[PDB]
Design a protein around this ligand. Structure first.
Ligand code: SF4
Ligand SMILES: [Cl-]
Length: 304
């Protein structure tokens, strides 16, 4: 409209004027995706974090990813519009729990999903995202691993690798991706030639009835090789916008409406304000950056 127009225009002028690059996750609102310089999944954001040139980064997503960007760029400025933008699943794994399980299952490497606190990362042998979890866990020599905080992704990794995956905490899961399998049954009836794509954070019954299971970055690539007219999408609602923009020739139907309240905390208004004030800076203890970069870089080493 007219008010969003002023905010958009200023964001683009200020970003240019101040030497910011704006990076956004796929679950950000459409209006912020549209103003970002790079929108992608966690893995793509991590790779982008290593190769960008700008000295200042405005990050639009949740805290753990902003902090990852910072860990890989300790001498650049990283700001976020809202510091409370967090991943509730991630926050239930603690350093005390990792220590507990390391003592309970000595020998086993600790693999942490990128949705994890930066302090938890310092204790990990290696980090993974949904895109590379299976690959990463295969290259570890141990046949037993400790994995968290997502039980669903861990269980997915166990199925694919055949390795024993001890998940922590007890019931770590993403509430956004708790779709009902009956939704897939229903959509099969309504659109019998649609392809169903879901995230590995979804529960097993949902995963098992999908045509494709993958990270949101992987989702965005499936239509490059699958000619299907209709795709049904089991991830957070913001992905629909991204998909529709990439492939205007196809139809994208949410499996169900699912919203990450934390991802929606960034708005045009607080994004503009962030560029105006150059705040809030992402700041981490030096020790945490030193100790956490290890398993993050290990992830890229075990990849290809
Ligand atoms: S969608 Fe789920 S896993 Fe991703 S940030 Fe939100 S609560 Fe965390
Ligand atoms: Cl395939």
């Amino acid at each position: 409209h007219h008010h969003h127009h002023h905010m958009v225009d200023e964001i683009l002028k200020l970003k240019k004027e101040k030497g910011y690059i704006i990076l956004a996750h796929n679950f950000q609102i459409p209006e912020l995706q549209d103003i970002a310089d790079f929108v992608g999944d966690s893995l793509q954001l991590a790779r982008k974090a290593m190769e960008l040139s700008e000295k200042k980064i405005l990050f639009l997503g949740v805290d753990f990813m902003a902090e990852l960007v910072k860990i890989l760029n300790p001498d650049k400025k990283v700001i976020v519009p809202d510091r409370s933008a967090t991943c509730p699943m991630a926050n239930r794994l603690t350093p005390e729990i990792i220590r507990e399980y390391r003592e309970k299952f000595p020998d086993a490497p600790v693999v942490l999903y990128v949705n994890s606190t930066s302090e938890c990362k310092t204790l990990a042998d290696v980090i993974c995202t949904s895109a590379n979890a299976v690959e990463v866990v295969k290259k570890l020599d141990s046949s037993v691993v400790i994995f968290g905080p997502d039980r669903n992704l861990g269980e997915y990794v166990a199925e694919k690798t055949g390795k024993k995956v001890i998940t922590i905490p007890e019931n770590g899961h993403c509430p956004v991706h708790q779709f009902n399998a009956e939704s897939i049954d229903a959509v099969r009836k309504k659109y019998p030639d649609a392809k169903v794509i879901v995230h590995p954070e979804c529960p097993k019954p949902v995963r098992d009835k999908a045509d494709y299971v993958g990270s949101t970055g992987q989702m965005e690539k499936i239509p490059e090789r699958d000619p299907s007219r209709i795709f049904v999408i089991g991830t957070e609602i913001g992905m629909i916008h991204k998909l529709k923009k990439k492939f205007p020739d196809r139809e994208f139907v949410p499996l169900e409406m699912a919203v990450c309240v934390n991802m929606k905390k960034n708005t045009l208004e607080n994004t503009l304000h962030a560029l105006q004030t150059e705040s809030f800076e992402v700041i981490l203890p030096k020790e945490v950056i030193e100790k956490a970069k290890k398993p993050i870089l290990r992830m890229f080493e075990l990849m290809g």
